[PDB]
Structure formats: C-alpha cells, structure tokens
Amino acid sequence: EKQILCVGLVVLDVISLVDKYPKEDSEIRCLSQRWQRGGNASNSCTVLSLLGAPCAFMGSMAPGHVADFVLDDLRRYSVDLRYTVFQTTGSVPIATVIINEASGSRTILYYDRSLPDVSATDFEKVDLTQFKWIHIEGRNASEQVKMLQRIDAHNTRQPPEQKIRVSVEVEKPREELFQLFGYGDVVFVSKDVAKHLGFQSAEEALRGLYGRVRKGAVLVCAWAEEGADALGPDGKLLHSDAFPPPRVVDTLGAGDTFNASVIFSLSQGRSVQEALRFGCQVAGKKCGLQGFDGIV
Amino acid sequence: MEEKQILCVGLVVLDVISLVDKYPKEDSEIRCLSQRWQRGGNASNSCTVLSLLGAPCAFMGSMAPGHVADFVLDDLRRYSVDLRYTVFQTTGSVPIATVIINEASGSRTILYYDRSLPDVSATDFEKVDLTQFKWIHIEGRNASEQVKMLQRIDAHNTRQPPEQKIRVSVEVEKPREELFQLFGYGDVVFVSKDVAKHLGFQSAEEALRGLYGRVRKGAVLVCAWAEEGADALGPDGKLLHSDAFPPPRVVDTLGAGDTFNASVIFSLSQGRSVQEALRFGCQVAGKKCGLQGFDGIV
Ligand SMILES: CS(=O)(=O)c1cccc2[nH]c3c(c12)CCCc1ccc(CN2CC[C@](O)(c4ccccc4)C2)cc1-3
Ligand SMILES: CS(=O)(=O)c1cccc2[nH]c3c(c12)CCCc1ccc(CN2CC[C@](O)(c4ccccc4)C2)cc1-3
Q1: Nearest to residue A183, comparing CAs of A162, A152, A220, A142?
Q2: Chain B contacts of A100, Cβ < 8 Å?
Q3: CA neighbor of B93 nearest in space, from B119, B121, B71, B65
Q4: What residues make up the domain containing B135?
Q5: How far apart (Å, rounded) are the C-alpha atoms in residues B126 and B120?
Q6: Shortest CA distance to A188 belongs to which of A226, A137, A150?
Q7: Is there a contact between A28 and B112 if contact means CB atoms under 8 Å apart?
Q8: Dihedral angle of Cα B135, B141, B143, B147, to the nearest 10 degrees
C-alpha cells in the first residue's frame, strides 16, 4: 500500500520537565526527564503513524547508541526505515529541551553534530511508485529543489489519479528556504518565518506570500493561539480557531502535529477548511499531554 | 602501611553541559557554543580536585550498570580514585543533570533528574574498613542513614588515640529540612550560600553566627559566599575570612563549591590552620572559575 514519505532530520531531544522557568545561576529539581526522538519531519511521522496512516521517514543517520534508540523508536511506530541514509561522518544532532509545565513553553538548546544532509543523489534512489504523498522539511534548499523537480518530472508521466501530492515546510527564517515556496501542492509557512518577513497575522502572511506559490498550490500558516489559516487558488481565505487544552503543558512538536494532521486530513480527501480544523484539534489536544501518544 | 586515604561518601552524576553566549529566553531556540559530557556530583567533583592536588582518595557511591556508569567509572579511574566501596544497585540508574553554562556571565544553571537509584545505606557503610582513611567527607543526602554512618565513625574514634582519630566533614548544600540535622555532626561542617539564603541569612557572617549553636562541640562551620569570599567560625568565636580570588574572566563556575570544599579538606588534612585552609580554598576555586572543567587548576 502507498505510504506518505517524510524527508527531513531526526534529532534526539533531552527533555527536562519543570514547574517554573529556571532563573539563571540556580539549581532546579525536574518534575521528570525523558528522551524523545525529535526533528520536524520525524515528529510528523510519529503523528501520521498515531493517526493510522502508513508512512516512511527519510533522514540522515550515523551508526551507534543514538541511532539504535532512534531506529528502535521509529520501529515502535511502524515508521518505514527503508530510506534511512547512513553517513560515515558526523553524529545524530542532540537538542536540550526545557519544558515549563506551568506555562507550556519549550526552550531548545541545539547542538549541530556535522551530520551530512540527505542529498539529491540519495533521493534519486527513492522508488516513487511507493508513495502517494511526499513531505519535505526545508533545510538544504538547493538539493531539495532537485528532489522536488524529480517528483514534478515523475508526475508529468502519471495520470491525475496517480500523481504524488507534495508538501513543503518553510519553518526557519533563512533566505535559502524561500525558493521552496514555488514547489509543492501544499506549502506550510511558520509564524516565525512570517514575523521575520514583517507580517503580523496569518491572513497578512498568506496574502503577502501567495504570489510565491506554484499555480494551484495551498499556502498554510498556523499562528499558535490565533489558530491557523490557509489560502488556495480560489482566493478564499480559510480559518480555524485554535483549540487550546484546559492546561497547556507541552508545546514541543505542536507545529509538527498540526502539519501531519493537515497532511493526513487532505490525503483522506477532506476540504482545506476541514483539514485546518482537524490540525488545530489534534495539535491543541497534544498541547495538553506530554509527548504524542495520548492524541489517540 | 601506605598513606591513608580521604573517603568521600556521596553521589556521582552525569552532567550534560550546554555552553551558551547568553541566557536563553523562555520559549526560544538557541545554538550552543559547545556541548559536553562531564562527570559531576558534589563528593565526586571533590575527589577530582583531591586527586589533582595529589591527595590519595576514595569514593563511595551508588551505581547502576550501563553506558552512563561506564563513562563515570572510567572517568574516576583516570584520576586514580579508589572505587572498592562502589555500591552496585539492581534498580534505578545513574542520575543525569542538565547544566547551562553562560560563558558571558560565568553562571551555571542546573536541572537535576533523580533516577530512583537507591542511596548508600548505613548497612553498606558498616562494611567499610575505617583503618584505611584519615578523613571522611559526607555529602548530605539521606540524612537519617548518614547520621548512623557518622555515629559509626564517632564510635571507631573512641577506641583510637588522638593521632589515629579520623577527621570528619559534612556538606549541607541543598535547602532540604532533612539535612539540617547533619549540622550537629563532623569536625568541619560546610553550609552552602544557597542553604544560608533559604534560611533567611544575607551574608556568610550572619549564617555562621546564626547556625553555630547547631554544630557539635569543637566543630568549625564553613560558608563560602561566591565573589564575597569565604568565612569560617570555630569554638573560640573568632570569625575567620578570606576574600575571593576571581579569575580575569569568569567562564565556568560548575563545581566551584566542590573545588572549595576539597581544597579546604586537603589543606586541613595536612595540618594547616583554618585561616590558611580558607585562603587556599578561595585560591583554588577562584582559579577553577577561570577555566572549563577541573584539570587546569594544576
Ligand atoms: C496547530 S496549533 O494548535 O494552532 C499550534 C501550532 C504550533 C504551536 C502552537 N502553540 C499553541 C498552539 C499551537 C495552539 C493551541 C495551544 C496553545 C496555547 C497557548 C499558547 C501560548 N503559550 C505557549 C508558551 C508561550 O508561548 C510562552 C512564551 C514565553 C513564556 C511563557 C509561555 C505562550 C500556544 C499554543
Ligand atoms: C570558593 S569560592 O572561590 O569563593 C567560590 C565558590 C563557589 C562558587 C563561586 N562563585 C564565584 C566564586 C565561588 C569566587 C570567585 C569567582 C567568582 C566570580 C564572580 C561570581 C559572580 N558571578 C557568577 C555567576 C553570577 O552569580 C550570576 C548570577 C545571575 C546571573 C548571571 C550571573 C555572577 C562568582 C564567583
């Protein structure tokens, strides 16, 4: 059966759950601490798996103890490991995450490991007949554009029913990533990217950036407690309010939960308006739980 | 018979250090300057310093087998710390502490995670042949069990001539009510600035005057107060002081308190006066604050 492919990076999150944000130069006792497999594309596979959609993860990996944890973690979620790109240099990146249970905040201290990125040559090895949807987490944009051109070229030879749907996420405010707006059926732009571009709402960001998307594409922008908006070729702005839980305890991976839920809903043939609502409902539910498991 | 060792009873921690250029704002993503794995724990860090200073030492702590235990045991072993009294546990794991070191300000922020590792009990301590040690330092943790260990040392000392008596030090570093009974034990009592402030004291002198009535007859109460230096108070009621010796650039204060304690113990265990030991404690700890880790102190 056709799967959803997620192309991105896997990070190991070292999470410290606290009752208050630590003051500089103090010693605080953690409520709990845990290891969790992170990374945008990687979190989206976890959510797609929990929602019941067969999915695969394509990312760079370096052999060892961290890879054993990560691959074992993916296996627990039946996330297909076929396209794992093993590297001979670098390590899996580690992120230190402070989660403030009282405010719901997540603070990340990121450590780059010098792990080589998935290249266009690595992607050429992917048998595209096995996938109905391919999601690409924007990172090494010049290589990723070649991957997207490979998908576009495959799609020209397929009937409309057999075309692979594509989504791209532009989550970091890096100039190199903005070329990715012109690719994919669904383009996810983060609130962080929108604010760095001068936009003060999801609606402003969509109207201001729609000119950059491919003909027929849907541009999506989640705006935390203000909910999420989308804009398609008909010019109709779509919106869903946020659905915050009674107590916000964990926002780590909330954006990834939203993206996976929108992809899931759209792949099942739901409207963009239904997909936005579903995204907000699942991410909102996630924000009231530690991790992802409790969403189901 | 060989030179007698200094035994440190405490816990070994794995420090997961994030070196940063600024203190992270809540809900933001920051890139670390570097990240490293370092063996921590108060008594464990004091062993590192005693070893670097050249004093033979031994560490008694709980351990759970695994990758973390292999890293911390190999690290202690590189410092020739005697580990024959390591208590291997069948439940729990070696604790992990997340440390944020702000290179710009010289701060250290600790997020500590108790990994349900059982503590060293009084029954575990009963197995220690005390004839090996000239000094026993106890990092306050499971106080009711530790009080029994201290009573065992006191009982051993009643049967020994004054030259053969084992000197004892205790550290009360965490502001936990259970630990305050430990002030009544040991020849030397270390009280942290954190404990003193939690108890309402605003200076080392106030803390020493305010807490001296709780120490054993003849004990020396010691309190280091970061950039204000360190003070000590003994049975004559004379408050002793050393100013701090700050480095030109304060880069790493993680384990500075442990550097001070080990240096004071080292100095007193070598017949130096309390005044000489305070000065030495500030000199070594002040030097440590100017460098990442402990090795550069020598
Ligand atoms: C798809 S979605 O569901 O729209 C979504 C996607 C991505 C991220 C998201 N964040 C949040 C939502 C959300 C929406 C519902 C839950 C929620 C409640 C409260 C806050 C606001 N809080 C969270 C810490 C906070 O940002 C903070 C900052 C600094 C100090 C203390 C707290 C202030 C955000 C969200
Ligand atoms: C045995 S000892 O040597 O007395 C000692 C024992 C234990 C801890 C120690 N800390 C420091 C010393 C020290 C003494 C000399 C070096 C020094 C210089 C400057 C500061 C002050 N800095 C360090 C972060 C700081 O306290 C901070 C607080 C909040 C925000 C940002 C930084 C502001 C402390 C020390």
Answers
A1: A152
A2: 26
A3: B65
A4: 3-298
A5: 11
A6: A137
A7: yes
A8: -10
Nearest in space to A155 (alpha carbons), one of A145, A166, A169: A166
How many angstroms separate the Cα of B77 from the Cα of each of A123, B4, B57, B119?
Answer: 47, 18, 11, 21
Q: Is A145 exposed, middle or buried (0-12, 13-18, 19+ CB in 10 A)?
A: middle
Residues B137, B169 contacting (CB under 8 angstroms)? yes
Q: Which residues of B touch A (CB under 8 A)?
A: 16, 18, 20, 23-32, 35, 67, 96, 98, 100, 102, 105, 107-114, 174, 194, 253
B257 Cβ below 6 A of ligand 2: yes
How close A119 comes to chain B (CA, Å)? Answer: 24
Cβ–Cβ < 8 Å for B115, B91: no
Residue A225 near ligand 1, beta carbon < 6 Å: yes
Pocket flag, ligand 2, residue B106 (CB < 6 Å)? yes
Angle among Cα B58, B109, A115 to the nearest 5 degrees reads 90
Residue from A207, A208, A201 nearest A222 by CA: A201
Closest residue to B112, CB basis, from A29, A103, A112? A29
Q: Is A237 touching ligand 1 by the criterion CB < 6 Å?
A: no
CB atoms A109 and B24 under 8 Å: yes
Compute how many other C-beta atoms are within 10 angstroms of the C-beta atom of residue A271. 12
Strands B5-9 and B133-139: parallel
User: Cα B157–B158–B159 angle (5° rounding)?
Assistant: 90
Measured between alpha carbons, how far is A71 from A80 in angstroms, rounded to an integer? 10
Q: Which residues of A touch B (CB under 8 A)?
A: 14, 16, 18, 21-30, 32-33, 65, 94, 96, 98, 100, 103, 105-112, 251
**What total number of domains does chain A contain?**
1
On whether the CB atoms of residues B39 and B48 are closer than 8 A, the answer is yes
d(CA A26, CA A23): 6
- The experimental method behind these coordinates is X-ray
Q: Supply B142's token pair.
A: 């499971």
For residue A230, give the nearest of A167, A292, A287, A144 by alpha carbon.
Answer: A167
Q: Does residue B41 come out as left (phi exceeding 0), alpha (psi in the -120 to 50 range) or beta?
A: left
- Residue A208 CB contacts under 8 Å (≥ 6 apart), including other chains: A197, A199
For residues B243 and B265, what is the distance between their CA atoms, to the nearest angstrom? 18
The C-alpha atoms of residue B43 and residue B295 are separated, in whole angstroms, by 17
Q: Please give the DSSP secondary-structure letter assigned to residue B82.
A: B
**CATH number for the domain that contains residue B112:** 3.40.1190.20
